[PDB]
Design a protein around this ligand. Structure first.
Ligand SMILES: [Zn+2]
Lengths: 66, 288, 1340, 251
DNA sequence: CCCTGTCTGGCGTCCTCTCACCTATGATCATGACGGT
DNA sequence: ACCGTCATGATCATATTATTACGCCAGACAGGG
């Protein structure tokens, strides 16, 4: 279901901007999880270009130049 | 309430009629002012499950996609195929309903001109590409989404479709509310699906399958009606037959589950002993 | 006959039903409750005496001392209301209490105390109520709002359907005490019976029945009947009453008297019961399988062994029968446990019980209350006697005992406040009866179960909580000191009492700030039945049913006036005629319809007495005697409307206005509006603003005079008489002699309230409306208030409206207004703002109020005096300096080095930062009142002494005018005395006023009268002198301030706003609208007479938003103005009074059987000219709510004027000058300006201040802030492909500080470019997550 | 920070940290004081509960409180909830160069332009006006320009009509549900104090004119002006994205 | 040992505007007014 | 009129109890056929 599916994501900021932050931050902390940003709300949190709209060319460029 | 409000607003409502009116309107204001919270929380859950999904390819390179048919509840055909397969790219190439013709090719967007050439040929159902069958890792390819919907063309490489989709489902959350036998209507041809049947002694084709779908196909090829016929019903008609508009074609009794047979012969009571297994209840008002 | 202000302008009145009970005093809830609270009340209850007699006498911890209670008394307040609002004090009264201390001796607490002491003691300050019904807490006039909560008593609810997911309903029985521990009996799906106390852990219910010292034999004696088995020679025979066998299938062939009655396999019919009870069958025969599961009642013991044969509440087997049969018992008592009739709920409950006696039950109850501690029999007895059975911790009120006896079908409604054994046993009996299928459950929203608290009861409860804290303190101190040496003011201290009552009146959830911008808004905020607050429900949790109008709100709580939004139906408003019962419920008047005749006696029914009887509807036709003219009449029996016969009715409603409130009974044609639009119309009629010259409603309901006079904005005459001196400041009434006291000679002075600030920044003015030499009657208006006119209620103004689409400028709901409206200055209102400048003492130095300001111009300071505080009456704009204040700062770390350096320069060089009080951004207006509050011991500057001399001369001149005009009336009485019995016609007025008091006269009542008037003269002289000295010592002395503030300068601006595109106007039916274009005069659609229409509405709002009442109001307003134009035509031609009398009489008859029936033949040729002087701007018409003016009466009144019958005039155009096709509707609608103006919402920000913890801009308008680019807007920009717009929308424009300074340099140099960086609030997120044990980083 | 007065309105975290440090100092002194076993067990237990109350208050039994009965807000309550950092300061932010006022009709407009008042226009475009004033040469330092627009002389309105001309703004109605609730217009200056909004566009915003309010936002940088003209312009949103139906239907 | 009531936690709409208001106390040196010489 | 006594206001650390009245809806837990 949609709230169990958005809280079970491979990106803990996406699952922490949404409902309960305690459960998700302890699960991510004891798992040692890492957030390869790669979505819209991680980049709205961290303050950069959205990887969808005009910023999709910027993220193509950055993903190409690694 | 069994006593209505016989006075309109140009005539005056008296006191009791206005008080019953206030019952009916206070319920509506409470429903909107509490409905809006669930509508907003639904939009939030939807844009946070979507949140990631970006059109990131141009073709996933597949041949799978869902089978768009017109939807029919049992009344007249509710939503036509041109509402469901408008601007969605076909999965395999649609055969023209005559015989084995390449009417449309296998990766064409179906805009209004293609949908009119679909409606002229009375095309049954289209196997079309759906987003849930997209093979793209981490995103949706540009063909399996479909038309842009506010642009005439296909979706561009990039445009966030998860967020516009989540907003478009959750945005009408305010307008939504919060709190015998089969009689045919039109005149056409009969077809049966999921059917295993047998002819009774009288002639009415009874069915030995519970899950039988009774379709009414017209003289053109498209499916215009559909119904669900239970296990053991008295069908007035048969397979492939032509009927008249309004003629009863089905009959059953839902309060009496039929234990009808396939063959004939004599009846024996196997493991039926009166006193422990079955009981003797002679009827009061009839005697049988 | 009519009162003299009702001969000024007599309102035309339609309406058919002759009234029998007039509208009561609309503020009776507040005033009657608080009069019930504070008054010397004998016989114990109610009031403060209930608290002082329930918490006292405080007796000590066995020290034989006791602090008992005598009486109480409130002294006068030190400050009256006006000085209290000006200065800022509470409006309180000191509560003196006479307490007594007694101290008993040793070995005899029934012996003599050695010493007593009775004395006066100070405790608390309770705030009094003003005559308007409001409190003044800290200079701001506040209202405590009535609460609607659950009635104390038993309550049998049914948890229907939802539990256990199998449809088996539960039943709980919540006992709701007024003060103490709750008690919930309930069931469970195993059909066991479970008690709980205050929502704690759950126990089986009969554990409390053992706690009341019941043995189990007595419990089964109570909760079941008995079945008798007699062992008489054959198969253990049975006593049988066949009523238990109603529908049971027997296991054998029941025969008796040698006759087969009942067959095996069949059930016992009712006629077989009749056979067995007709033949009087007693003993029948049972098999050995019949008592295989029968449950024994009491214990049987064997006499030989001394053991127990079978325990109580146990099923019987073969061996138990074999044991008790050979022990000598012939009688066997069992229980009847049926499927439908009587379940064994008590029996299964006792089988779940582990306890066996009183002690174990008390131990288990003591253990579920306080978990995990050693119980002791004394502690368990003390706890269970202090839960329910003590006068201290448990108290149903009289309301609670009434509901608890009524809902258990008792007789006496009087009982103790504590429970007993019979009470809990009757609760369990009624719960088992409801489970058995007979009797009904009780709904919650039924208004026989919703009590109304008010100001008096809630203040009593908060005062009682203060008293139980102070009895903790007094029990501490009384037995821990030396006696006798102390007095009962060293023990009791006034801090918790005053803290409790000051916290309740100061900040509660029900002591709220009065919405005061309108007389209507006052008088409908004081009448409010809020469901929220302490003890009630909350907005974001509940619910569905409580937000819905129950069928018993009819005539108690208004159905249509409630705030839409998050709390609909919780902020209910009380109706017009609805009183409050003795206990606290709601009651409403009715008319006792005896068998044929509607008797005109009123008779108050509550919410549960209404249900049993049958009530006729309000507007039922009756022919002059009371006989109902139909033979089917619409009535309502038990919450359900129907059609009943002519003479089975028992009550009729009083008047047809009683379902609605006073907010929504000033709406004309209410019966034509759909209820949503009537709701929005009543709410916006509450939200109006007072204009400059309020006019009148042409189409009212006649309810305006009750709302105006019964509020407190007009100056109602106390004693009637003759006016002597009218002025814009004061009004002097000379009291008539047939209304007048013998002593205290008496001519009254009304000091009006001129331009001062309301709470909503409006301008609460009072204008005198009487002439000079004019008679006034007792109970009559003298001075109109804000939004009043001649004692009526004029909220907005009435303007010429047309319904037509006009070139798109009224598209959705907009309004288009001619410039003729703004030229007439008719929507110009007066606001008063109160700007304040405090001057504190910092630790860098004190601040000054000097006029010298660093780095400003002399032209900016020319509006100041030599003292630095602005003159009275200088029109300022935004940015002008009102109070020149500079920060007295600096301080260069003291020391000798700097000590000798300060001598050279001298004083302060420039260590004064500029922090003056300035006008807010974008207003104007006039400085009308300046106050200077100064701490005593600080030098008062020049303008402070100037204001003190001004107020001192004003007070002395005003009190001298009081004494002078009062003694002018007194000497005018003295002259009237001396003429009778010893006249000096021409001799008296030559000899002086001193030698009138000592002139001789005959010893009669006249000489005694002279002695009375003389001593009243001398007493008023001495009283004048002492109160002048008291007023001077109140003015000249210092003022209390906050700790560490030197002086406060307050400046009152009076802004005078106007109209503009963007304001919100609305009618009285829900037709809102932003006024969209202020057209010139010429563009308006005019008609074939010449007059332009003022406002062009939009027709398309009528068929969807179904408020058809505004079009009938428009047509009747045009009829009213047609009569007014014909009066203006018959008066402008200077016609004699005969033709005016003819036409006014024809315009006042005009209808069906109506109530008005005036005649002008008793107005005598001078009042008719003045009545026509008041009717020439239109004729006011009353239209009561549900008994209004029908269509044919509007047509007949439009025929009296020469207007067209259909109401529609053909209208030309202003632009083209050619006719609009299909003639349009014009008329007058009474439209209101709302105070949602557009130069209070408009705001803009380039770059302002930034917040401190997260470097983002501030929020609001007063703080110069930026609009919240919220979360859904971020989603809407993700939904496009706008990526750079969102990046600068949440990095550059908002948060990143180096990013935004780079941005500002780049914008002022022309280079549109952003250097992005990181949000600083994300670094705040890193520090808050990192401040836990979590290690968040940034890789690479 | 102190509020208006002479006292400091202290935060809740300072109460939490100050209690943990008070208890930790007491426990060091006791462990120093060689107290018996009970002392140290209650002391360490009070420290455990103090730390557990600092981190996530109220997850243990009934939460501690300072004033008056309301519990005080801890670190986890600075993160979680509707008013934490995610939902209140990182997903939604307060925003400079933004404005808000009551809307009204103005039917003379073309559907790519909206009316915008002169007072709001001179406040939202202060840096562009400063840059324009410094380009002409009328003034010298920045102060002079801020005095000029604080006085509002006769020459800054031509400057304002030359910074408006081709510069779109984002109008936004306050409950934005779908993407058609943020649309970009070109301003046309209004004598008045109310945003004039083209009527057809109202059916997209669900905006009637019964007292509604809208916010204006200014695209500062150049890529944002181009995104407002090329993606978010009101001429570009004539079909609703939920279907194929036109959203500029005449109402 | 697989169903099962029962208990515990965790959600519950966005944007805006106006107003008022944040424990009690228990103990003592030193200032301040009152009375005798 | 000066000297001595009762009274009354500053600064200052001390550290937590006798109310209940949402409505689902998952998720974990002891109980028992
Ligand atoms: Zn695909």
């Amino acid at each position: 279901g949609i709230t169990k599916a958005s809280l079970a994501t491979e990106s803990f900021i996406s699952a922490a901007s949404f409902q309960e932050t305690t459960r998700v931050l302890t699960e991510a902390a004891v798992a040692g999880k890492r957030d390869e940003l790669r979505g819209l709300k991680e980049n709205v949190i961290v303050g950069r270009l959205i990887p969808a709209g005009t910023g999709y060319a910027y993220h193509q460029d950055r993903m190409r130049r690694r | 309430i069994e006593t209505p409000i016989t006075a309109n607003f140009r005539e005056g409502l008296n006191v009791l009629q206005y008080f019953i009116s206030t019952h009916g309107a206070r319920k509506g204001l409470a429903d909107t002012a509490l409905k809006t919270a669930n509508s907003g929380y639904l939009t939030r859950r939807l844009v946070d499950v979507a949140q990631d999904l970006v059109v990131t390819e141009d073709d996933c390179g597949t041949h799978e996609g869902i089978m768009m048919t017109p939807v029919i509840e049992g009344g007249d055909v509710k939503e036509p195929l041109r509402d469901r397969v408008l601007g969605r790219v076909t999965a395999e190439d649609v055969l023209k309903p005559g015989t084995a013709d390449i009417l449309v090719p296998r990766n064409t967007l179906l805009h209004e001109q293609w949908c009119d050439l679909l409606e002229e040929n009375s095309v049954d159902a289209v196997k079309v590409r759906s987003v849930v069958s997209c093979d793209t890792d981490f995103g949706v390819c540009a063909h399996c989404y479909g038309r842009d919907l506010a642009r005439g063309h296909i979706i561009n490489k990039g445009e966030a479709i998860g967020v516009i989709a989540a907003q478009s489902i959750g945005e009408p959350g305010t307008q939504l509310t919060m709190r015998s036998s089969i009689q045919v209507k039109n005149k056409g041809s009969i077809k049966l699906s999921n059917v295993k049947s047998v002819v009774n002694s009288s002639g009415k084709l009874v069915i030995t399958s519970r899950n039988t779908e009774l379709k009414l196909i017209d003289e053109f090829g498209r499916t215009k009606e559909s119904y669900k016929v239970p296990y053991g019903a008295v069908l007035a008609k048969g397979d492939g037959e032509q009927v008249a508009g309004g003629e009863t074609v089905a009959n059953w009794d839902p309060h009496t589950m039929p234990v009808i047979t396939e063959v004939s012969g004599f009846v024996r009571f196997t493991d039926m002993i009166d006193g422990q297994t079955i009981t003797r209840q002679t009827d009061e008002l009839t005697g049988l | 006959v009519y009162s003299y202000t009702e001969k000024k302008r007599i309102r035309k009145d339609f309406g058919k039903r002759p009234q029998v009970l007039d509208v009561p005093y609309l503020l009776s809830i507040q005033l009657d409750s608080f009069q019930k609270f504070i008054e010397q009340d004998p016989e114990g209850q109610y009031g403060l005496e209930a608290a002082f007699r329930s918490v006292f006498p405080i007796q000590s911890y066995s020290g034989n001392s006791e602090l008992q209670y005598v009486s109480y008394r409130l002294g006068e307040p030190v400050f009256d209301v006006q000085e209290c609002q000006i200065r800022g004090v509470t409006y309180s009264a000191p509560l003196r209490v006479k307490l007594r201390l007694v101290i008993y001796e040793r070995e005899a607490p029934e012996g003599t105390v050695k010493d007593i002491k009775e004395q006066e003691v100070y405790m608390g300050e309770i705030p009094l109520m003003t005559d308007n019904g409001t409190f003044v807490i800290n200079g701001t006039e506040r209202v405590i709002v009535s609460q609607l909560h659950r009635s104390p008593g038993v309550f049998f609810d049914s948890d229907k359907g939802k539990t256990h997911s199998s449809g088996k309903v539960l039943y709980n029985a919540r006992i709701i005490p007024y003060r103490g521990s709750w008690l919930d009996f309930e069931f469970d799906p195993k059909d066991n019976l479970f008690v709980r106390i205050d929502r704690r852990r759950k126990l089986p219910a009969t554990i409390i029945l053992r706690a009341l010292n019941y043995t189990t034999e007595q419990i089964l004696d109570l909760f079941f009947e008995k079945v008798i088995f007699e062992i008489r020679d054959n198969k253990l025979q049975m006593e049988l009453v066949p009523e238990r066998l109603r529908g049971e299938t027997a296991s054998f062939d029941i025969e008796a008297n040698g006759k087969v009655y009942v067959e095996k396999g069949r059930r016992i019919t009712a006629r077989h019961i009749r056979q067995l009870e007709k033949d009087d069958v007693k003993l029948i025969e049972v098999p050995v399988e019949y008592i295989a599961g029968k449950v024994v009642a009491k214990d049987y013991i064997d006499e030989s062994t001394g053991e127990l044969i079978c325990a109580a509440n146990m099923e019987l087997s073969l061996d138990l029968l074999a044991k008790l049969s050979q022990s000598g018992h012939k009688r066997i008592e069992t229980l009847f446990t049926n499927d439908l009739d009587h379940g064994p709920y008590i029996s299964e409950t006792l089988r779940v019980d582990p306890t066996n006696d009183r002690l174990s039950a008390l131990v288990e109850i003591y253990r579920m209350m306080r978990p995990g501690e050693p119980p002791t029999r004394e502690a368990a007895e003390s706890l269970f006697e202090n839960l329910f059975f003590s006068e201290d911790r448990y108290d149903l009120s009289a309301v609670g005992r009434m509901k608890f006896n009524r809902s258990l079908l008792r007789e006496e409604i009087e009982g103790s406040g504590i429970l007993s054994k019979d009470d809990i046993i009757d609760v369990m009996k009624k719960l088992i009866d409801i489970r058995n299928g007979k009797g009904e459950v009780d709904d919650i929203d039924h208004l026989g179960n919703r009590r109304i608290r008010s100001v008096g009861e809630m203040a009593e409860n908060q005062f009682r909580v203060g008293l139980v804290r102070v009895e903790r303190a007094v029990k501490e101190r009384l037995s821990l000191g030396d006696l006798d040496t102390l007095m009962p003011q060293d023990m009791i201290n006034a801090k918790p009492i005053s803290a409790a009552v000051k916290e309740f009146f100061g900040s509660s959830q029900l002591s709220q700030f009065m919405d005061q911008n309108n007389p209507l808004s006052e008088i409908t905020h004081k009448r409010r039945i809020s469901a929220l607050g302490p003890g009630g429900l909350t907005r974001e949790r509940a619910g569905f049913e409580v937000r819905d109008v129950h069928p018993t709100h009819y005539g108690r709580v208004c159905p249509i006036e409630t705030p839409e939004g998050p709390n609909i139906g919780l902020i209910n408003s009380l109706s017009v005629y609805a009183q409050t019962n003795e206990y606290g419920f709601l009651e409403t008047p009715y008319r006792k319809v005896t068998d044929g005749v509607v008797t005109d006696e009123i008779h108050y029914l509550s919410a549960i007495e209404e249900g049993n009887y049958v009530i006729a509807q309000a507007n039922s036709n009756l022919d002059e005697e009371g006989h109902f003219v139909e033979d089917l009449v619409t009535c309502r029996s038990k919450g359900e409307s129907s059609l009943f016969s002519r003479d089975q009715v028992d009550y009729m409603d009083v008047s047809t206005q009683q379902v609605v409130s006073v907010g929504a009974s000033l709406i004309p044609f209410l019966e034509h509006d759909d209820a949503n639009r009537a709701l929005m119309g009543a709410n916006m009629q509450r939200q109006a603003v007072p204009t400059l010259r309020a006019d009148k409603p042409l189409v009212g309901t006649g309810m305006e005079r009750a709302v105006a006079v019964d509020s407190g904005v007009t100056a109602v005459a106390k004693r009637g008489g003759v006016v002597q001196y009218v002025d814009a400041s004061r009004i002097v009434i000379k009291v008539n002699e047939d209304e007048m006291y013998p002593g205290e000679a008496g001519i009254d002075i009304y000091n009006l309230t001129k331009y001062t600030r309301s709470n909503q920044n409006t301008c609460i003015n009072q204008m005198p409306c009487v002439s000079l030499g004019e008679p006034v009657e007792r109970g009559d208006v003298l001075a109109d208030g804000p939004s009043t006119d001649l004692g009526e209620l004029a909220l907005g103004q009435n303007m010429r409206v047309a319904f037509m689409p006009w070139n798109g400028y009224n598209f959705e709901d907009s309004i288009l207004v001619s410039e003729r409206v703004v030229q007439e200055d008719r929507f110009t209102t007066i606001h008063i703002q109160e700007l304040a400048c405090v001057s504190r003492d910092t630790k860098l130095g004190p601040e000054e109020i000097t006029a010298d300001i660093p780095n400003v111009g002399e032209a900016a300071l020319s509006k100041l005096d030599e003292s630095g505080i602005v003159y009275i009456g200088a029109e300022v704009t935004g940015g002008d300096i009102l109070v020149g204040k500079v920060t007295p700062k600096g301080e260069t770390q003291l020391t000798p080095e700097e000590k000798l350096l300060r001598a050279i320069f001298g004083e302060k060089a420039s260590d004064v930062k500029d922090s003056s009080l300035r006008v807010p951004n974008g207003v104007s207006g006039t400085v009308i009142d300046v106050q200077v509050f100064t701490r005593d011991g600080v030098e008062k500057d020049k303008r402070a002494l100037e204001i003190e001399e001004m107020q001192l001369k004003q007070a002395k001149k005003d009190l001298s005018e009081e004494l002078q005009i009062l003694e002018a009336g007194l000497f005018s009485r003295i002259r009237a005395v001396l003429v009778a019995g010893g006249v000096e016609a021409e001799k008296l007025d030559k000899l002086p006023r001193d030698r009138w008091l000592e002139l001789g006269l005959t010893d009669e009542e006249k000489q005694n009268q002279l002695e009375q008037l003389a001593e009243q003269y001398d007493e008023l002289k001495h009283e004048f002198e002492k109160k002048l000295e008291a007023k001077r010592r109140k003015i000249t002395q210092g003022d209390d301030l906050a700790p560490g503030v030197l002086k406060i300068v307050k400046v009152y601006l009076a802004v005078k706003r106007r109209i503009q595109p963007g304001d919100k106007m609305a009618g009285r039916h829900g037709n809102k609208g932003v006024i969209s274009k202020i057209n010139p005069i010429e563009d308006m659609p005019y008609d074939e007479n010449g007059t332009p229409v003022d406002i062009v509405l939009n027709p398309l709002g009528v068929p969807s938003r179904m408020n058809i009442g505004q079009i009938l109001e428009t047509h009747l307003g045009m009829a009213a103005k047609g009569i007014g134009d014909k009066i203006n035509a018959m008066l402008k031609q200077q016609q004699e009074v005969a033709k005016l009398r003819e036409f006014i009489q024809r315009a006042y008859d005009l209808g069906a059987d109506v109530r008005q029936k005036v005649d002008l033949s008793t107005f005598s040729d001078e009042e008719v000219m003045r009545l026509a002087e008041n009717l020439r701007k239109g004729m006011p018409i009353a239209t009561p709510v549900f008994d209004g003016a029908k269509e044919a009466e509007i047509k007949e009144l439009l025929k009296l004027g020469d207007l067209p019958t259909s109401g529609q005039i053909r209208l030309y155009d202003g632009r083209t000058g050619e006719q609009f096709e299909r003639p349009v509707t014009v008329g007058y609608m009474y439209m209101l300006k709302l105070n949602h103006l557009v130069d209070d919402k408009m705001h803009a920000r380039s770059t302002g201040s930034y917040s401190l913890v997260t470097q983002q801009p501030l929020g609001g308008k007063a703080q110069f802030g930026g609009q919240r680019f919220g979360e859904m807007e971020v989603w809407a920009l993700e939904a496009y492909g706008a990526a750079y717009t969102l990046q600068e929308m949440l990095t550059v424009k908002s948060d990143d500080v180096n990013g935004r300074t780079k941005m500002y340099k780049n914008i002022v140099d022309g280079n549109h470019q952003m250097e992005p960086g990181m949000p600083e609030s994300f670094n705040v997120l890193l520090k808050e997550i990192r401040s836990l044990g979590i290690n968040i980083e940034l890789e690479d | 920070v102190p509020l208006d007065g002479g006292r400091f309105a202290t935060s809740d975290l300072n109460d939490l940290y100050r209690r943990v440090i008070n208890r930790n100092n007491r426990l060091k002194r006791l462990l120093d004081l060689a107290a018996p076993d009970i002392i140290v067990r209650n002391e360490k237990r009070m420290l455990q509960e103090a730390v557990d109350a600092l981190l996530d208050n109220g997850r243990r039994g009934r939460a501690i409180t300072g004033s008056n009965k309301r519990p005080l807000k801890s670190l986890a309550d600075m993160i979680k909830g509707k008013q934490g950092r995610f939902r209140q300061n990182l997903l939604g932010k307060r925003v400079d160069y933004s404005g808000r006022s009551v809307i009204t009709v103005g039917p003379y407009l073309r559907l790519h332009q909206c009316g915008l008042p002169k007072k709001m226009a001179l406040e939202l475009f202060k840096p562009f006006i400063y840059g324009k004033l410094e380009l002409r040469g009328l003034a010298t330092t920045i102060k002079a320009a801020k005095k000029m627009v604080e006085r509002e002389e006769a020459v800054v309105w031509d400057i304002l009509d030359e910074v408006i001309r081709e510069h779109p703004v984002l109008l936004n109605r306050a409950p934005t549900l779908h993407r058609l609730g943020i649309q970009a217009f070109e301003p046309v200056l209004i004598e008045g104090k109310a945003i004039q909004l083209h009527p057809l566009v109202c059916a997209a915003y669900n905006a009637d004119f019964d007292g509604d309010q809208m916010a204006v936002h200014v695209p500062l940088t150049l890529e944002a002006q181009l995104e407002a003209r090329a993606l978010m312009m009101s001429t570009n949103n004539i079909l609703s994205p939920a279907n194929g139906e036109p959203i500029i239907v005449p109402s």
